[PDB]
Paper text:
To assess the structural basis of cold adaptation, we determined the crystal structures of AKNc and AKDr to resolutions of 1.99 and 1.75 Å, respectively, using molecular replacement. In the structure of AKNc, Val28 in the N-terminal α1 helix interacts closely (<4 Å) with conserved hydrophobic residues in the β3 strand (Leu91) and the C-terminal α9 helix (Phe183, Val186, and Ile190). Val118 and Val173 of AKNc are adjacent to each other (<4 Å) in β4 and β5, respectively. Their side chains are found in the hydrophobic interior of the CORE domain, making contacts with residues in β1, α1, and α9 such as Val13, Lys21, Val182, and Val186. However, there is room for improvement in hydrophobic packing around the two Val residues (Val118 and Val173).
The structures comprised the characteristic three-domain arrangement: the CORE (residues 1–38, 69–136, and 143–193), AMPbind (residues 39–68), and LID (residues 137–142) domains.
Author numbering: 9 to 193
The structure:
């Protein structure tokens, strides 16, 4: 079972995914976490990825998809399903995933307003300092989300597997909608 979780920067994808892990026991893989682990290793690749992420741009498909596949294989013997958080972010990412790994059975669209996202991320940046959570980068991330990631939602509407959750609600209320969608599989 492969669930794609897609939504804008600060929409709440990670938060929902962690609640899914606690209740359903799925494996949460986050493209952003995997990339940041590479940056942390101090590799030369990590330095290149750090520069791209600091600017709010997309890392190349080849690198991100390798790391997702790497992480899925590492968990394959224990997982009863996967939550793929933050991948895909463009239609070609979904297609290559389906070529190289498998088809998703559900896409959870974590839908938040643009203003709400800016506020959440500005607050998180003030708190925890994540280097891409500054105002300029937030704006680029959000603009790129509108442009590149929204057509992913359409693709999977065509496929018939998108379920939208209202991420303007409180966290637990969103999670009731998430749980409905997952229970109905
Ligand atoms: N597939 C890909 N291809 C190419 N490049 C890629 C890639 N994936 C990653 N990258 C690169 O890596 C970078 C980082 O990607 P990534 O780490 O994916 O960051 P992102 O998508 O910008 O999303 P965040 O994780 O910032 O937000 P989130 O939606 O999970 O929200 P959270 O739950 O944390 O919550 C946000 C805040 O709001 C709070 N909150 C959450 N829900 C609610 C709620 N309902 N009410 C109130 N507060 C809430 C949370 O507590 C938190 O403080 C990308 O910009 C790109 O450069």
């Amino acid at each position: 079972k492969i669930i794609f979780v897609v939504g804008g920067p600060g929409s709440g994808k990670g938060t929902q995914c962690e609640k899914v892990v606690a209740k359903y026991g799925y494996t949460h893989l986050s493209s952003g976490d995997l990339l940041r682990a590479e940056v942390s290793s101090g590799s030369e690749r990590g330095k290149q990825l750090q520069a791209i992420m600091q600017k709010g741009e997309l890392v190349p498909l080849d690198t991100v998809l390798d790391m997702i596949k790497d992480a899925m294989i590492a968990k394959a013997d224990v997982s009863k399903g996967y939550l793929i958080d933050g991948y895909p972010r463009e239609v070609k990412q979904g297609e290559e995933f389906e070529k190289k790994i498998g088809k998703p059975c559900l896409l959870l669209y974590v839908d938040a307003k643009g203003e709400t996202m800016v506020k959440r991320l500005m607050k998180r940046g003030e708190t925890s300092g994540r280097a891409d959570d500054n105002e300029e980068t937030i704006k680029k991330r959000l603009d790129l989300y509108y442009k590149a990631t929204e057509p992913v939602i359409a693709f999977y509407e065509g496929r018939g597997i998108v379920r939208k959750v209202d991420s303007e609600l409180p966290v637990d209320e969103v999670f009731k909608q998430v749980s409905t969608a997952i229970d109905a599989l």
